[PDB]
Paper text:
Photosystem I (PSI) is one of the two photosystems functioning in light-energy harvesting, transfer, and electron transfer in photosynthesis. Cyanophora paradoxa (hereafter referred to as Cyanophora) is a glaucophyte alga that is thought to be an ancient eukaryotic alga evolved from prokaryotes, because it has a characteristic chloroplast termed cyanelle. We present a 3.8-Å resolution cryo-electron microscopic structure of tetrameric PSI isolated from the glaucophyte alga Cyanophora paradoxa, which reveals differences with PSI from other organisms in subunit composition and organization. The structure of a PSI-monomer unit within the tetramer is similar to that in the cyanobacterial and plant PSI cores, except that the cyanobacterial PSI contains an additional subunit PsaX that is lacking in the Cyanophora PSI, whereas the higher plant PSI has additional PsaG and PsaH subunits but without PsaM.
Despite the presence of a large hole in the center of the Anabaena PSI tetramer but almost no free space in the center of the Cyanophora PSI tetramer, the interactions of each protomer within the Cyanophora PSI tetramer are weaker than those within the Anabaena PSI tetramer. This is manifested by the fact that the GraFix method has to be used to isolate the stable Cyanophora PSI tetramers to prevent dissociation of the tetramer into monomers. The cryo-EM density map of the GraFix PSI tetramer shows features of well-resolved side chains of most amino acid regions and cofactors. The dimeric PSI unit is organized by interactions between monomers1(1′) and 2(2′), forming a pseudo-two-fold symmetry. This reflects that the tetramer is assembled by a dimer of dimers, which are designated as monomer1/2-dimer and monomer1′/2′-dimer, respectively. In the Cyanophora PSI tetramer, two monomers denoted as monomer1/1′ are rotated approximately 90° relative to its counterpart in the Anabaena PSI tetramer, resulting in the direct interaction of PsaL of one monomer (monomer2/2′) with PsaK of the adjacent monomer (monomer1/1′) at the center of the Cyanophora PSI tetramer. On the other hand, at the edge of the tetramer, PsaK of one monomer (monomer2/2′) is too close to PsaL from the adjacent monomer (monomer1/1′), leading to the loss of PsaK, which occurs in monomer2 and monomer2′.
Residue numbers in the entry:
A (entry chain bL): 15 to 145
B (entry chain bJ): 3 to 39
C (entry chain bE): 1 to 62
D (entry chain bA): 14 to 752
E (entry chain bF): 26 to 186
F (entry chain bD): 78 to 216
G (entry chain bC): 2 to 81
H (entry chain bI): 4 to 33
């Protein structure tokens, strides 16, 4: 074959997380499955900035710290679109036509990522500075 | 047996021995040969 | 004309043995080009001692 | 069964005139000058020319005897120079002030200042090898005993060299004798290792224990009785630890508790000498004796019983392993190179354990506080220990090219390692990079926050702390074991985990080495550089036969320089170049281990203790807030502690300062070979052999360049010699001055 | 008086080395036994510095403001023993090492198999070859005038262009 | 003709072989007939087993289907191997032996592509083809 | 791809052809004597430039020469 | 203040645009 047959390759309980994440999933539209990614990566990214920052013990640490978290995401949706210009030159048609093989929804992935990538970010700033 | 003494490395050290052996006794004999007296 | 058992010089300037003395081995007495098989005292880079030369490429220092 | 060929090759000086008589292509004569380097590489490469698995083994069995001889010659050289050219008899009178000195210099052109004012009535080079504390431990009192050992070694040196002649040129064993590994383990555990410590227990109780217990009281070196007098006189020995009046009779009625006086479990440091209690090491080697002797009645021989290793490896196989160890016994009887790699790994790794267990449990009297020596046996055995692991990586790769067989090894563990070798390396590749970022990048973070004046932002103890909680819980539970889980131990296993300090003279034998944020930060650098040295060496073994890039790397040999500039370039694809590459990383791995060790002891552990009770250390506890940045590592360790090696001129350390420059020279010379290539230096011969042909004296052996691997090999061999001998000279002329 | 150095028989510069050589070693000799074996290694040592300095005061050395004898190679015969006379001592031995292998590699290359004879150093040839190397300041002069020292530039192997 | 699928040797393994390039461009295959049940080192890891076969194995590149044959013919004395390069995603079936006979041997009808009728110092100089599109080493 | 040229100094020894790891070279009938053979490079698009070939020609200066040219996926030996 | 405003523009924000459009030029095919 091509791959190897261990006793734990292609095991069910890890495939249940694999084929149900919002990037390998079945029916989600590429505007929406980029939201669940952007809601995911955004909420924790304001973790490291607010307890490990240049100023941590001020008014002032969660507020400024969380500007850099949305300030990181805007460099990521940039890096998503430069991947869109360079991998999808016209979204050249390929073997699967996923969101990922052939593009077709990439700036709907990109715009979907930025919604939670600002939305989930300040939600933790709500949950950290208040509550 | 003496044909082994003719080979390269044994003669590259025993002539390295007496020639270094000549410089070392003459300095113990005649110390500090800096200028031709 | 060069016969077997002669000492040459080398005008093949693309060679390692160029302008060196070679004692030839044989001539192929048929029409295959570069027939002068010239053994040398010295060995080259890739460890050969003899080479095909042309009759226009060997001399008769003798 | 012992089967022998009698005199297969006789005693001839006739083959001594032909170099390369062992081989085929080199028993014809040189035509270029590389034939010398073609010769001198593959001399002791025994399966390069020999095809006979039995005859290739008989050479190895002989050559080990010769290597057994040259140590015995070298041992006698230590033992001979210990009597005549040493201040040893004076040193037993006073172990605290006088430095151990041997290798006296001849009175010639200016090296007679190296025979400095060392002490006693003596002039010589202060040595740091610890033979003085190894002979004081062994019970040596007079200088005659050191003489008779040397001739006693020299006759064993001669007996070993004759035995190598006797077993190849006279009585060559066969391969069915060689392959009996089970009977070999029975004896080597039984005879060599069982009766090793038993005989040293037979020495240490009757010889070392009386005369070293007396020197703790310290009556006199002359007034201690001779070592044979404690077997003759029954009353003289039983004055101290008086169980010898009971004789062997408690030992023969199984009432062994009557030897609670010399065969004990004291377990600390002997506070007068700072070393391990030799009573314990007598009980140690006695327990090692019975443990190894019962370890040696385990394997099968011609008496039916025993475990047979071909039976044990089979039926050690599980569902994640397929065939398991099927055929792996058949490897280690059929391949010397597979044996040498595993024998080397656990031999170097063993010696790093020796370096660790000797500074924290000092075994010898007056070795602990003599900081000249307690350092230098750490850093030597560490250095030996890394070179053997690189040799373990080499012969593991040599097994893969020349000895590994995929016919026998189907679906077993060498098959299943080779069939997932990317998952090993690429996860190893990740954990190398992860470790470099999160250990070394924590210094570059720490460099910048000190440079930018933000010490609240660096990683320190008064800062963002990275506390080693696992190494403080382990250091806790081992220091609270004497009485809870080791009740019969009086004090702990060492004073390095916890407990009070100990002093000998005015210097500290041992104190608890503490592990804070700066010790967490360096221990991951060790974990980083070891994983890279694994990654270089592991990839060399695994991809030794093929890869994706070349499918027949097994055909091109173990040591071939490149496959040319094809596929973008294939320079250094061979397994030998991986061993060549791992040598600098092992140079990098170990030299930071020494830099961790030799700095942590001087600032935190070693030092001078007051008669009030506190310790002022040497470099003054700077390892806490100084060792977290590179500039502190550069200033307060490298720049500051080298102030005594370059100011060594005019003193008896002045040979060290020359070497500290002399090794800076060779290390620079090695850069010429690593940074250059062959096809430059070949064409400089062509202009120069033109000039030697020009004046009609040209050598018939025409000169060529060095081979690329020999250009690589001389580039690393001068790199290590330039780099270690710098550290050899730095560590000497630091700790001889301040210790 | 050629580069601004006193002839240091009169110098306070060369003499301010001798005291702090002999005071360093006497302070290394004070705590010894006068009948010890290192003591003669510290009494003869100052004597080894004593024969050296009284060889330098007489030879006419030019010592600077430091007290170090500096060398002057423009070679005048007033300072000829510094470089020139150990120069002629060098070159006469250097051609003996020069011509010996030169006369050897002419004498073994004019035989059957000289490739072996670089490994084996043949005393039937090497003592024969230094016998040609002893007349080396006379042999090479009649070897260049007879032309058999060098060769023409189509005998010597030429890399291509 | 490939005969895909021909029965592959019973293997089960190898992280190192036939990855995502094979499903976008140009994978390879080699055909031979095994005259025993002997084991051989693959270019990926080592074992498969030679069947009776019909023995096909989708290797990675050209170099691995050539270096397998130089390992097959020496060890197992089988000179029947018939390499390929695939259909739709590949270029030319039956890349070796291109003539039906082994092209290390000489055979009538072949073409002398890439012959220069000179010596290599007899090539023109690159000072002589300045701003000229003729290749220096080409006839 | 790389350019592989075969010069007329070939002695039909077949060493080169049996050295190529990707089967780029072959021996072809020569017409100057109709008995010897010369090497040819019909598949230079597969030449990786390893230069194993040139290491097999016995003649004092190569009959086959490899001049590195445009690099491609095939020539770089990528399994990926 | 130019020193407090221009150096993120030309240290970050203008390098964010040119290194984008450099990379954008690189992978383009006809
Ligand atoms: C030369 C250009 C440049 C400039 C002006 C800065 C400036 C800064 N860097 Mg530095 N940095 C740079 C290059 C630069 N960097 C480079 C080239 C490297 C790699 C070596 C670094 C590595 C580095 C690290 C590791 C860190 C910094 C940090 C910082 C900040 C410290 C003060 C602060 O956080 O206030 C507190 C205020 C905030 C955290 C919020 C300020 C506004 C944020 C940045 C943007 C908010 C979103 C905004 C609307 C849109 C995104 C902006 C983007 C498009 C430009 C300061 C903004 C630290 C930091 O805090 O990161 C954020 C920090 O940890 N830098
Ligand atoms: C026993 C250890 C040993 C050591 C330290 C050496 C060391 C050396 N040998 Mg070697 N060699 C050895 C064993 C050893 N050899 C043996 C046992 C033989 C067979 C008798 C040789 C046969 C040999 C030859 C033919 C040559 C050397 C040469 C050399 C020298 C390398 C170049 C040079 O510096 O001059 C070096 C000193 C080369 C040399 O120049 O000799 C002076 C050289 O040409 N050796
Ligand atoms: C091979 C080179 C070499 C040469 C040419 C010399 C030459 C000399 N030696 Mg020396 N020597 C050498 C190596 C050499 N030695 C070595 C290797 C040793 C150690 C065994 C010695 C140990 C030695 C001693 C103990 C003595 C000499 C002495 C002498 C001198 C007188 C010879 C004699 O037998 O009386 C003579 C200048 C004698 C001398 O004049 O010393 C002051 C003398 O007493 N030699
Ligand atoms: C390459 C540069 C160089 C030069 C020009 C010199 C020159 C000298 N050195 Mg120095 N030295 C050098 C490199 C050099 N050395 C190196 C590399 C070292 C480390 C090993 C030393 C370490 C050193 C020491 C320890 C001593 C010298 C001494 C000397 C003096 C030699 C006195 C003598 O015995 O001649 C007399 C000459 C003969 C009797 C005939 C020579 C016969 C030989 C064997 C011919 C060789 C042919 C084969 C001479 C001024 C001595 C001195 O007095 O310093 C001023 C001295 O004690 N040198
Ligand atoms: C382990 C290897 C070893 C090494 C590196 C040395 C090194 C040395 N020995 Mg020692 N020696 C050794 C083993 C060794 N020895 C053994 C096993 C014996 C008992 C036979 C001796 C007996 C011995 C004596 C009696 C003396 C030395 C001396 C020396 C020093 C001068 C060299 C010399 O005399 O050789 C001689 C040169 C050759 C054999 C080359 C020809 C040198 C430090 C001398 C010394 O220490 O002076 C202070 C000295 O007097 N050695
Ligand atoms: C019980 C007696 C006995 C003792 C004291 C030893 C001791 C030794 N053997 Mg061992 N050996 C033994 C029984 C013993 N053997 C038996 C019965 C066999 C055959 C099954 C071997 C087969 C053997 C081999 C093949 C080798 C040793 C070797 C060694 C030496 C290892 C070097 C060292 O660490 O010190 C050591 C002297 C090594 C050695 O030095 O060989 C010369 C070695 O290569 N032994
Ligand atoms: C079982 C391991 C072991 C240990 C820890 C010791 C410890 C000691 N030995 Mg002893 N010895 C042993 C076995 C051991 N011995 C054996 C098997 C022999 C015969 C070869 C000897 C022969 C011997 C002599 C002749 C002398 C000593 C001396 C000493 C003391 C000096 C320090 C030292 O040697 O480094 C410590 C060494 C190690 C930590 C490495 C142990 C190496 C063995 C082979 C490990 C065996 C594997 C074991 C089952 C598992 C442990 C693995 C790893 C943790 C080590 C020290 C108490 C000297 C002394 O008397 O000092 C006063 C001394 O002169 N030993
Ligand atoms: C393995 C080497 C070894 C050797 C050769 C000896 C030899 C000896 N022992 Mg010793 N002994 C040893 C190990 C050894 N012992 C060990 C490992 C222990 C600890 C269990 C002892 C504890 C011991 C005691 C208590 C006594 C001896 C005694 C003796 C002597 C008379 C025993 C006899 O021959 O019957 C004899 C010289 C007797 C003796 O003479 O003691 C001074 C005696 O009373 N031994
Ligand atoms: C000091 C010089 C130096 C440095 C920095 C490196 C670095 C590395 N070597 Mg190399 N190596 C060196 C000398 C060096 N080597 C030499 C002299 C040799 C010849 C023997 C080699 C031979 C060698 C081999 C054989 C191997 C390595 C490997 C590695 C990598 C190991 C994994 C790692 O730590 O990644 C993390 C990277 C670092 C720790 C580098 C420092 C990065 C800093 C701390 C962070 C960056 C700051 C900032 C973000 C930078 C950008 C700022 C800007 C954009 C504004 C690492 C990149 C191995 C490898 O590739 O494994 C995967 C490997 O196998 N090296
Ligand atoms: C680690 C636990 C472990 O060793 O599991 C044990 C497992 C092998 O267990 P089995 O009982 O299947 O194997 C038996 C043989 O290993 C020896 O009898 O090893 C693997 O799965 C590979 C380990 C590397 C796995 C990388 C993680």
């Amino acid at each position: 074959i091509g791959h190897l047959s261990t006793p734990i390759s292609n095991s069910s309980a890890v495939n249940g997380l694999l084929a149900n994440l919002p990037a390998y999933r079945k029916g989600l539209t590429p505007r929406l499955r980029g939201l669940e990614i952007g809601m995911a990566h955004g909420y924790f990214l304001t973790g490291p900035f607010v307890e490990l920052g240049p100023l941590r013990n001020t008014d002032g640490g969660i507020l400024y710290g969380s500007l850099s978290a949305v300030g990181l995401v805007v460099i990521l949706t940039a890096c998503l679109a430069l991947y869109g210009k360079a991998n999808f030159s016209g979204s050249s048609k390929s073997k699967d036509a996923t969101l990922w093989e052939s593009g077709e929804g990439w700036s709907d992935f990109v715009s979907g990522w930025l919604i939670g990538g600002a939305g989930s970010v300040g939600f933790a700033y709500l949950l950290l500075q208040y509550i | 047996f003496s044909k082994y003494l003719s080979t390269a490395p044994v003669i590259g050290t025993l002539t390295a021995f007496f020639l270094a052996g000549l410089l070392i006794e003459i300095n113990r004999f005649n110390p500090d040969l800096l200028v031709y007296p | 004309m060069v016969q077997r058992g002669s000492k040459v010089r080398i005008l093949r300037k693309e060679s390692y043995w160029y302008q060196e003395i070679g004692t030839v081995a044989s001539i192929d007495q048929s029409g295959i080009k570069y027939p002068v098989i010239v053994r040398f005292e010295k060995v080259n880079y890739s460890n050969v001692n003899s080479n095909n030369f042309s009759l226009d490429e060997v001399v008769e220092v003798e | 069964k012992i089967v022998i060929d009698k005199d297969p090759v006789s005693t001839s000086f006739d083959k001594w005139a032909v170099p390369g008589h062992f081989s085929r292509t080199l028993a014809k004569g040189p035509k270029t000058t590389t034939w010398i380097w073609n010769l001198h590489a593959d001399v002791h490469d025994f399966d390069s020319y020999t095809s006979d698995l039995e005859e290739v083994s008989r050479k190895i069995f002989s050559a080990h005897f010769g290597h057994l001889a040259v140590v015995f010659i070298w041992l006698s050289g230590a033992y001979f120079h210990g009597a005549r050219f040493s201040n040893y008899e004076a040193w037993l009178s006073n172990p605290t002030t006088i430095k151990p000195s041997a290798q006296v210099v001849w009175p010639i052109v200016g090296q007679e200042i190296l025979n400095g004012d060392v002490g006693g009535g003596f002039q010589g080079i202060q040595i740091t090898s610890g033979l003085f504390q190894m002979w004081r431990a062994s019970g040596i009192t007079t200088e005659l005993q050191l003489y008779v050992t040397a001739i006693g070694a020299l006759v064993m040196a001669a007996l070993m060299l004759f035995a190598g002649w006797f077993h190849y040129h006279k009585a060559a064993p066969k391969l069915e004798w060689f392959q009996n590994a089970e009977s070999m383990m029975n004896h080597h555990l039984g005879g060599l290792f069982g009766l090793g410590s038993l005989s040293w227990a037979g020495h240490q109780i009757h010889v070392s224990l009386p005369v070293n217990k007396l020197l703790d009281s310290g009556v006199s070196p002359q007034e201690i009785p001779l070592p044979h007098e404690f077997i003759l006189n029954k009353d003289l020995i039983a004055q101290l630890y008086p169980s010898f009046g009971q004789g062997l009779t408690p030992f023969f009625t199984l009432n062994w508790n009557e030897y609670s006086d010399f065969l004990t479990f004291k377990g600390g440091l002997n506070p007068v000498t700072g070393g391990l209690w030799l009573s314990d090491s007598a009980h140690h080697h006695l327990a090692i004796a019975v443990l190894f002797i019962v370890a040696g009645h385990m394997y099968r021989t011609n008496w039916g019983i025993g475990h047979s290793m071909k039976e044990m490896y089979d039926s050690h196989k599980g569902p994640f392993t397929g065939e398991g160890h099927k055929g792996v016994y058949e490897i280690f009887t059929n391949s010397w190179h597979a044996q040498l790699s595993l024998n080397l790994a656990l031999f170097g790794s063993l010696s790093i354990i020796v370096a660790h267990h000797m500074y924290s449990m000092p075994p010898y009297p007056y070795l602990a506080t003599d900081y000249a020596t307690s350092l230098c046996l750490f850093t030597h055995h560490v250095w030996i220990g890394g070179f053997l692991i690189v040799g373990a990586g080499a012969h593991a790769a040599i097994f893969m090219v020349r000895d590994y067989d995929p016919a026998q090894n189907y679906n077993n563990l060498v098959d299943r390692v080779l069939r997932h070798r990317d998952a090993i390396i690429s996860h190893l590749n990740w954990v190398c990079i992860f470790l470099g970022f999160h250990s070394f990048g924590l210094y570059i973070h720490n460099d910048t926050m000190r440079a930018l004046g933000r010490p609240q932002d660096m990683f320190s103890d008064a800062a963002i702390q990275l506390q080693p909680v696992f190494a403080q819980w382990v250091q806790g539970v081992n220091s609270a074991a004497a009485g809870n889980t080791a009740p019969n131990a009086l004090a702990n296993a060492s004073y390095a985990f916890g407990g009070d300090i100990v002093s000998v003279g005015g210097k500290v034998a041992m104190m608890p080495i503490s592990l804070g944020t700066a010790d967490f930060l360096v221990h991951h650098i060790h974990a980083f550089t070891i994983h890279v040295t694994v990654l270089i060496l592991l990839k060399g073994v695994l991809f030794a036969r093929n890869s994706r890039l070349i499918p027949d790397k097994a055909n091109l040999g173990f040591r071939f320089p490149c496959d040319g500039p094809g596929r973008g370039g294939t320079c250094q694809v061979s397994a030998w170049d991986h061993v060549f590459l791992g040598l600098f990383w092992m140079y990098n791995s170990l030299s930071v281990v020494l830099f961790h060790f030799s700095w942590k002891m001087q600032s935190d552990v070693w030092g001078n203790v007051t008669a009030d009770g506190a310790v002022s250390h040497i470099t003054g506890n700077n390892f806490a807030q100084g060792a977290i940045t590179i500039n502190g590592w550069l200033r307060d360790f490298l720049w500051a502690q080298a102030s005594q090696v370059i100011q060594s001129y005019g003193s008896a350390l002045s040979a060290y300062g020359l070497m500290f420059l002399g090794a800076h020279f060779i290390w620079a010379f090695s850069l010429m070979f690593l940074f250059s290539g062959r096809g430059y230096w070949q064409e400089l011969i062509e202009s120069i052999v033109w000039a030697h042909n020009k004046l009609k004296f040209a050598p018939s052996i025409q000169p060529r360049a060095l081979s690329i691997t020999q250009g690589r090999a001389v580039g690393v061999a001068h790199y290590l010699l330039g780099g270690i001998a710098t550290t050899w000279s730095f560590f000497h002329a630091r700790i001889i001055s301040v210790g | 008086d050629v580069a601004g150095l006193i002839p240091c028989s009169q110098s306070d510069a060369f003499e301010r080395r001798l005291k702090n050589t002999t005071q360093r070693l006497e302070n290394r000799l004070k705590k010894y036994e006068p009948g010890s074996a290192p003591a003669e290694a510290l009494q003869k040592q100052i004597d080894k510095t004593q024969q050296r300095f009284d060889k330098y005061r007489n030879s006419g050395l030019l010592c600077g403001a430091d007290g170090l004898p500096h060398l002057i190679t423009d070679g005048r015969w007033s300072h000829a023993g510094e470089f020139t006379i150990p120069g002629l001592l060098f070159l006469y031995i250097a051609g003996f090492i020069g011509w010996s292998g030169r006369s050897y590699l002419q004498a073994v290359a004019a035989s059957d198999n000289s490739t072996e004879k670089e490994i084996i150093i043949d005393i039937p040839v090497a003592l024969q070859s230094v016998s040609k190397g002893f007349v080396w300041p006379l042999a090479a002069l009649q070897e260049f005038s007879s032309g058999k020292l060098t060769a023409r530039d189509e005998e010597i192997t030429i890399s291509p262009r | 003709t490939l005969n895909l699928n021909a029965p592959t040797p019973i293997f089960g393994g190898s992280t190192g072989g036939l990855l995502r390039k094979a499903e976008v461009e140009e994978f390879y295959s080699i055909t031979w007939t095994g005259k025993s049940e002997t084991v051989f080192e693959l270019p990926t890891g080592g074992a498969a087993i030679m069947r009776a076969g019909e023995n096909l194995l989708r290797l990675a590149r050209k170099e691995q289907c050539i270096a397998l044959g130089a390992q097959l013919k020496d060890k197992f004395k089988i000179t029947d191997y018939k390499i390929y390069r695939v259909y739709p995603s590949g270029e030319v079936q039956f890349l070796h032996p291109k003539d039906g006979v082994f092209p290390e041997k000489v055979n009538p009808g072949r073409v002398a592509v890439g012959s220069n009728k000179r010596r290599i110092g007899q090539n023109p100089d690159p000072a002589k083809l300045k701003f000229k599109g003729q290749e220096t080493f080409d006839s | 791809a790389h350019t592989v040229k075969i010069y007329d100094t070939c002695i039909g020894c077949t060493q080169c052809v049996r050295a190529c790891p990707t089967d780029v070279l072959e021996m072809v009938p020569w017409d100057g004597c109709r008995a010897n053979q010369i090497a040819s490079a019909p598949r230079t698009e597969d030449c990786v430039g390893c230069k194993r070939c040139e290491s097999a020609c016995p003649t004092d200066f190569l009959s086959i020469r490899v001049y590195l040219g445009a690099e491609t996926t095939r020539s770089m030996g990528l399994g990926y | 203040n130019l020193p407090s405003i221009l150096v993120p523009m030309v240290g970050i924000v203008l390098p964010a645009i040119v290194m984008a459009l450099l990379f954008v030029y690189i992978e383009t095919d006809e």
